[PDB]
Enzyme design. Structure first.
Site, PDB file in Angstrom:
ATOM      1  NE  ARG A 107      -2.573  -1.836   3.373  1.00 52.76           N
ATOM      2  CZ  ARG A 107      -3.070  -1.832   4.603  1.00 52.76           C
ATOM      3  NH1 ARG A 107      -4.042  -0.970   4.908  1.00 52.76           N
ATOM      4  NH2 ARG A 107      -2.612  -2.680   5.522  1.00 52.76           N
ATOM      5  CD1 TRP A 276       5.902  -4.767  -7.520  1.00 48.64           C
ATOM      6  CD2 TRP A 276       5.032  -3.017  -8.624  1.00 48.64           C
ATOM      7  NE1 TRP A 276       6.125  -3.641  -6.763  1.00 48.64           N
ATOM      8  CE2 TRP A 276       5.604  -2.554  -7.418  1.00 48.64           C
ATOM      9  CE3 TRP A 276       4.430  -2.094  -9.486  1.00 48.64           C
ATOM     10  CZ2 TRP A 276       5.572  -1.215  -7.044  1.00 48.64           C
ATOM     11  CZ3 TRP A 276       4.407  -0.757  -9.116  1.00 48.64           C
ATOM     12  CH2 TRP A 276       4.981  -0.330  -7.910  1.00 48.64           C
TER      13      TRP A 276
HETATM   14  C1  HEM Z   1       1.913  -2.564  -6.589  1.00 45.23           C
HETATM   15  C2  HEM Z   1       2.427  -3.603  -5.917  1.00 45.23           C
HETATM   16  C3  HEM Z   1       1.604  -4.552  -5.004  1.00 45.23           C
HETATM   17  C4  HEM Z   1       2.156  -5.499  -4.235  1.00 45.23           C
HETATM   18  C5  HEM Z   1       3.673  -5.787  -4.120  1.00 45.23           C
HETATM   19  C6  HEM Z   1       1.098  -6.194  -3.534  1.00 45.23           C
HETATM   20  C7  HEM Z   1       1.244  -7.231  -2.628  1.00 45.23           C
HETATM   21  C8  HEM Z   1       0.195  -7.912  -2.042  1.00 45.23           C
HETATM   22  C9  HEM Z   1       0.280  -9.154  -1.306  1.00 45.23           C
HETATM   23  C10 HEM Z   1       1.585  -9.934  -1.060  1.00 45.23           C
HETATM   24  C11 HEM Z   1      -0.947  -9.488  -0.888  1.00 45.23           C
HETATM   25  C12 HEM Z   1      -1.294 -10.770  -0.093  1.00 45.23           C
HETATM   26  C13 HEM Z   1      -1.985 -11.674  -1.119  1.00 45.23           C
HETATM   27  C14 HEM Z   1      -1.637 -13.140  -1.020  1.00 45.23           C
HETATM   28  O1  HEM Z   1      -0.647 -13.495  -0.332  1.00 45.23           O
HETATM   29  O2  HEM Z   1      -2.355 -13.964  -1.650  1.00 45.23           O
HETATM   30  C15 HEM Z   1      -1.883  -8.465  -1.356  1.00 45.23           C
HETATM   31  C16 HEM Z   1      -3.257  -8.399  -1.147  1.00 45.23           C
HETATM   32  C17 HEM Z   1      -4.152  -7.445  -1.625  1.00 45.23           C
HETATM   33  N1  HEM Z   1      -3.858  -6.364  -2.463  1.00 45.23           N
HETATM   34 FE1  HEM Z   1      -1.926  -5.761  -2.876  1.00 45.23          FE
HETATM   35  N2  HEM Z   1      -0.103  -5.621  -3.919  1.00 45.23           N
HETATM   36  C18 HEM Z   1       0.160  -4.610  -4.832  1.00 45.23           C
HETATM   37  C19 HEM Z   1      -0.788  -3.813  -5.456  1.00 45.23           C
HETATM   38  C20 HEM Z   1      -2.152  -3.733  -5.218  1.00 45.23           C
HETATM   39  C21 HEM Z   1      -3.108  -2.911  -5.948  1.00 45.23           C
HETATM   40  C22 HEM Z   1      -2.723  -2.010  -7.150  1.00 45.23           C
HETATM   41  C23 HEM Z   1      -4.331  -3.118  -5.415  1.00 45.23           C
HETATM   42  C24 HEM Z   1      -5.703  -2.496  -5.781  1.00 45.23           C
HETATM   43  C25 HEM Z   1      -5.855  -1.364  -6.475  1.00 45.23           C
HETATM   44  C26 HEM Z   1      -4.177  -4.057  -4.318  1.00 45.23           C
HETATM   45  C27 HEM Z   1      -5.175  -4.537  -3.496  1.00 45.23           C
HETATM   46  C28 HEM Z   1      -5.042  -5.668  -2.706  1.00 45.23           C
HETATM   47  C29 HEM Z   1      -6.109  -6.345  -1.993  1.00 45.23           C
HETATM   48  C30 HEM Z   1      -7.598  -5.935  -1.960  1.00 45.23           C
HETATM   49  C31 HEM Z   1      -5.583  -7.392  -1.351  1.00 45.23           C
HETATM   50  C32 HEM Z   1      -6.394  -8.351  -0.458  1.00 45.23           C
HETATM   51  C33 HEM Z   1      -6.426  -9.729  -1.079  1.00 45.23           C
HETATM   52  C34 HEM Z   1      -6.908 -10.745  -0.082  1.00 45.23           C
HETATM   53  O3  HEM Z   1      -7.644 -10.367   0.872  1.00 45.23           O
HETATM   54  O4  HEM Z   1      -6.554 -11.944  -0.262  1.00 45.23           O
HETATM   55  N3  HEM Z   1      -2.843  -4.413  -4.232  1.00 45.23           N
HETATM   56  N4  HEM Z   1      -1.137  -7.524  -2.043  1.00 45.23           N
HETATM   57  C1  LIG Z   2      -2.653  -6.475  -7.164  1.00 40.06           C
HETATM   58  C2  LIG Z   2      -1.936  -7.617  -6.498  1.00 40.06           C
HETATM   59  C3  LIG Z   2      -0.563  -7.557  -6.358  1.00 40.06           C
HETATM   60  C4  LIG Z   2       0.107  -8.607  -5.749  1.00 40.06           C
HETATM   61  N1  LIG Z   2       1.455  -8.548  -5.620  1.00 40.06           N
HETATM   62  N2  LIG Z   2      -0.583  -9.677  -5.302  1.00 40.06           N
HETATM   63  C5  LIG Z   2      -1.928  -9.758  -5.418  1.00 40.06           C
HETATM   64  C6  LIG Z   2      -2.654 -10.980  -4.893  1.00 40.06           C
HETATM   65  O1  LIG Z   2      -3.709 -10.614  -4.004  1.00 40.06           O
HETATM   66  C7  LIG Z   2      -4.779 -11.456  -3.801  1.00 40.06           C
HETATM   67  C8  LIG Z   2      -4.605 -12.798  -3.456  1.00 40.06           C
HETATM   68  C9  LIG Z   2      -5.720 -13.613  -3.258  1.00 40.06           C
HETATM   69  C10 LIG Z   2      -5.593 -15.075  -2.893  1.00 40.06           C
HETATM   70  C11 LIG Z   2      -6.881 -15.743  -3.371  1.00 40.06           C
HETATM   71  N3  LIG Z   2      -7.319 -16.798  -2.453  1.00 40.06           N
HETATM   72  C12 LIG Z   2      -7.664 -18.015  -3.205  1.00 40.06           C
HETATM   73  C13 LIG Z   2      -7.843 -19.155  -2.212  1.00 40.06           C
HETATM   74  C14 LIG Z   2      -8.866 -18.775  -1.149  1.00 40.06           C
HETATM   75  C15 LIG Z   2      -8.628 -17.380  -0.583  1.00 40.06           C
HETATM   76  C16 LIG Z   2      -8.500 -16.365  -1.703  1.00 40.06           C
HETATM   77  C17 LIG Z   2      -6.995 -13.087  -3.413  1.00 40.06           C
HETATM   78  C18 LIG Z   2      -7.169 -11.755  -3.753  1.00 40.06           C
HETATM   79  F1  LIG Z   2      -8.420 -11.277  -3.890  1.00 40.06           F
HETATM   80  C19 LIG Z   2      -6.056 -10.947  -3.954  1.00 40.06           C
HETATM   81  F2  LIG Z   2      -6.195  -9.647  -4.274  1.00 40.06           F
HETATM   82  C20 LIG Z   2      -2.631  -8.722  -6.023  1.00 40.06           C
END
Ligand code: HEM
Ligand SMILES: Cc1cc(N)nc(COc2cc(CCN3CCCCC3)cc(F)c2F)c1
Ligand code: HEM
Ligand SMILES: Cc1cc(N)nc(COc2cc(CCN3CCCCC3)cc(F)c2F)c1
Ligand SMILES: C[C@H](O)[C@H](O)[C@H]1CNc2nc(N)[nH]c(=O)c2N1
Ligand SMILES: C[C@H](O)[C@H](O)[C@H]1CNc2nc(N)[nH]c(=O)c2N1
Ligand SMILES: [Ca+2]
Ligand SMILES: [Cl-]
Ligand SMILES: [Cl-]
Ligand SMILES: [Gd]
Ligand SMILES: [Gd]
Ligand SMILES: [Zn+2]
Lengths: 400, 402
Positions: A107, A276
């Site tokens: 973020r 990314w």
């Molecule tokens: C730009 C570089 C970004 C990086 C390095 C990054 C990294 C991550 C990581 C590591 C997670 C945990 C997801 C997982 O482990 O499955 C995550 C979740 C999330 N990201 Fe970011 N992200 C980026 C950009 C963004 C952008 C551009 C958005 C929306 C405009 C965003 C919205 C979210 C949301 C909503 C989650 C929650 C997903 C969940 O609840 O599983 N991210 N992000």
């Molecule tokens: C923009 C962005 C950047 C980044 N570097 N990485 C991510 C990955 O973020 C998410 C990762 C998950 C994991 C999905 N998972 C499947 C099994 C059951 C629980 C949900 C759900 C989401 F909505 C995400 F935005 C997103």
């Protein structure tokens, strides 16, 4: 009533005063904490509260422009049952939803987000063109840029815009009569839907799936992504020459396509966003989870590690080298990537900025701490407070 | 419905029905989760006592028996006459085991049934307190074949101070506030180190000086006791293939023995009840030696390993941390001192969750503390959703006595 929040590496104390604004209720109660669970006409009051946020955010609280937009949306809902966001309110809402996402470690970047307004879209063929432009802009020949494309909101009596795929880029997963999966086990269900709707299946470990796009009140449509559009990084290792031969690869753009965006009481079920990758997402979770590609023992055997005793830490040694391969291979191909140390250091800076900007920051500790070397990163030692603010991204039922 | 709990490695789904029996409230609300925070009377005694007695008679499959009803009547009359009551010996053993079993942050609970319980409720002085503790250390160490144990000192009672052990663990290294503002030794122990000096201890100047014990008998200032060096087993650290590692001069002690928590059983409170088990290697290798606010050796080891410490993307921190954990495990195994690595420990905790789901319909567990500090998702507990709640009997934090 204002939680105390400590950093155990430094000893610094802050207070989270923003958690008082938590609009929704989470899953925890005084009796039991559920933080580790993955999934745990009053339209007017939501719409009203979002407008005050926006005008506070542009230092125009209670101004004439403020009072005009309020009576605007009131009449708009008293005419159709919904209302339309100004183009700028939509840009501000997209960014806030990212800024409010507790589980996102990226973020620090929330203010730089390219918002693509696709609310004038109809038919899946036009979705596909909007989506392909997003992909081309966000890929940018490997110099990745954040972006979201917002398709028409939900409205009464009419269907919905949905992207059936959980991500824009996904590798197929096929089963056999020995039960096992070839390709990505996470995508076994979406893959048989693609076959079920017309796709002729490949047979490889990294077959990029087609898109199943759904316009209101019609069955979804199959769409193939042009191969030159999906940027992929073949994985090799700086010093283990055999690593290349394992044939591993991953793609450039993490682009989430199945979450719902909520802005001032309005809901957008198709609003895919991309950033990314952090290297541990690919090298630890996607390649090394036991229910994903599960390659750790293959790599360990190639490194001639002692795999018959846990205490040689062969799983740890193999995991590190895979993450090293991921980082080296993305850099070599000039594709944007960030390692978990750089990333968690940036989130600490984000927490400090947010403390000053609005008195706190909703953060989900279990998702912020990386899946390898947890306590080697500063976020491990940082207490966090998790709560729901709006605008927000939410999970939603699958369309079937 | 009760909370639904998923294992994402297997896809399997359980429901935690045990959480509905939680008593003492936790720190979360529907408005905000505080799960990541480290530190977040006659009728009340009787309801707690009655529930505990019911727990005891359930455990021996004799609920509702004649003996069960008479023991309840017996506790009721003692509370009415004295405002308090005494545990039977069998109840104290059972209660201490249940407190371990109920501890949400302990990954070693597969062992909860094999706990040696030393009854020191008739202790009367700080000198006797020290003798009990020495016999505990000797029994638990057992010349490197460690055995889990707890010694229960007299319970809190009105009109008399508490027994307390001032030290947080029975074996701790000194932390000397150096005159720069730095620390020589263990920085986590600067406060207890300075209290020992202020109480008559002549301090050393090494990085691994074993601290003396400060023992508090009721209504008495703490008294200083030096542990006999032959009772405190230590392990020099060496690496199986990096021969220069031995020249770092690193050591750790064999016995993890927490001495500052309060044991609560059926409404009764035991403010001094030190307990011990054996180490999991990441407690030593990752936290104690690589935390930046502890011994903080990670950069020195990497430099010695000739890793490129000028860029995070080399993952030098991850490589040096792994080799330090290897050295810890190799060194305890060479010294023939019990130790468990984080893969075997978390595998055994998954077996414990399954046992508890069958036995009680749930298991209180704190995900952030069960998941080890390195290689988290390489272990199976990472992918296991957990429900955190407070049951009694319990081990609780308590204020520092000074
Ligand atoms: C730009 C570089 C970004 C990086 C390095 C990054 C990294 C991550 C990581 C590591 C997670 C945990 C997801 C997982 O482990 O499955 C995550 C979740 C999330 N990201 Fe970011 N992200 C980026 C950009 C963004 C952008 C551009 C958005 C929306 C405009 C965003 C919205 C979210 C949301 C909503 C989650 C929650 C997903 C969940 O609840 O599983 N991210 N992000
Ligand atoms: C923009 C962005 C950047 C980044 N570097 N990485 C991510 C990955 O973020 C998410 C990762 C998950 C994991 C999905 N998972 C499947 C099994 C059951 C629980 C949900 C759900 C989401 F909505 C995400 F935005 C997103
Ligand atoms: C037998 C081998 C044992 C192992 C491998 C083990 C392992 C662990 C570990 C790794 C932790 C997290 C501690 C930290 O990071 O600071 C912990 C916490 C804890 N252990 Fe165990 N333990 C063992 C025995 C015992 C025994 C015998 C007891 C009590 C009778 C006990 C009670 C506790 C309690 C109460 C905590 C929680 C402390 C807190 O709330 O911070 N353990 N254990
Ligand atoms: C019997 C046993 C075996 C083992 N292998 N390991 C332990 C570790 O048990 C504890 C360890 C600590 C470390 C100090 N910690 C600092 C951060 C905030 C919480 C306290 C505190 C406690 F209370 C504990 F019970 C205990
Ligand atoms: C059960 C547990 O909540 C689940 O494995 C979580 C833990 N933390 C995580 N953290 C991140 N970043 N991504 C994840 O998918 C998960 N999964
Ligand atoms: C802030 C955070 O709660 C704190 O650093 C916790 C996280 N998880 C932990 N887990 C264990 N096992 N031991 C610890 O000391 C901690 N520390
Ligand atoms: Ca068959
Ligand atoms: Cl991913
Ligand atoms: Cl310790
Ligand atoms: Gd070979
Ligand atoms: Gd060597
Ligand atoms: Zn919680």
């Amino acid at each position: 009533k204002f939680p105390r929040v400590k950093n155990w590496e430094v000893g610094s104390i802050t207070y989270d005063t923003l958690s008082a604004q938590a609009q929704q209720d989470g899953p925890c109660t005084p009796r039991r904490c559920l933080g580790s669970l993955v999934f745990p006409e009053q339209l007017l009051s939501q719409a009203r509260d979002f407008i005050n946020q926006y005008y506070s955010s542009i230092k125009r609280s209670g101004s004439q422009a403020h009072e005009q937009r309020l009576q605007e949306v009131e009449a708009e809902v008293a005419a159709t049952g919904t209302y339309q966001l100004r183009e700028s309110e939509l840009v501000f809402g997209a960014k806030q939803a990212w800024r409010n996402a507790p589980r996102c470690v990226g973020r620090i970047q929330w203010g730089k987000l390219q918002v693509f307004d696709a609310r004038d879209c109809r038919s899946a063929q036009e979705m596909f063109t909007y989506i392909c432009n997003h992909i081309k802009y966000a890929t940018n020949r490997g110099n990745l840029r954040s972006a979201i494309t917002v398709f028409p909101q939900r409205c009464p009596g009419r269907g919905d815009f949905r992207i059936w795929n959980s991500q824009l880029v996904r590798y197929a997963g096929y089963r056999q009569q020995d039960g096992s999966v070839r390709g990505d086990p996470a995508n076994v269900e979406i893959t048989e839907l693609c076959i079920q709707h017309g796709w002729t299946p490949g047979n490889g470990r990294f077959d990029v799936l087609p898109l199943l796009l759904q316009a209101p009140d019609e069955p979804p449509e199959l769409f193939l992504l042009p191969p030159e559009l999906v940027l992929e990084v073949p994985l090799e290792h700086p010093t283990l020459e055999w690593f290349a031969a394992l044939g591993l690869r991953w793609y450039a753009l993490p682009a989430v396509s199945n979450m719902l965006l909520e802005i001032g009481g309005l809901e957008f079920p198709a609003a895919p966003f991309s950033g990314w990758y952090m290297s541990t997402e690919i090298g630890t979770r996607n390649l090394c989870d036991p229910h994903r590609y599960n390659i750790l023992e293959d790599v360990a055997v190639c490194m001639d590690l002692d795999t018959r005793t846990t205490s040689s830490l062969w799983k740890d040694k193999a995991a590190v080298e895979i993450n090293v391969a991921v980082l080296h291979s993305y850099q070599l191909a000039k594709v944007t990537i960030v390692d978990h140390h750089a990333a968690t250091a940036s989130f600490m800076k984000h927490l400090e900025n947010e403390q000053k900007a609005r008195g706190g920051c909703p953060a989900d500790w279990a998702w912020i701490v990386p899946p390898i070397s947890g306590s080697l990163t500063p976020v491990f030692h940082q207490e966090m407070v998790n709560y729901f603010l709006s605008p927000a991204f939410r999970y939603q039922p699958d369309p079937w």
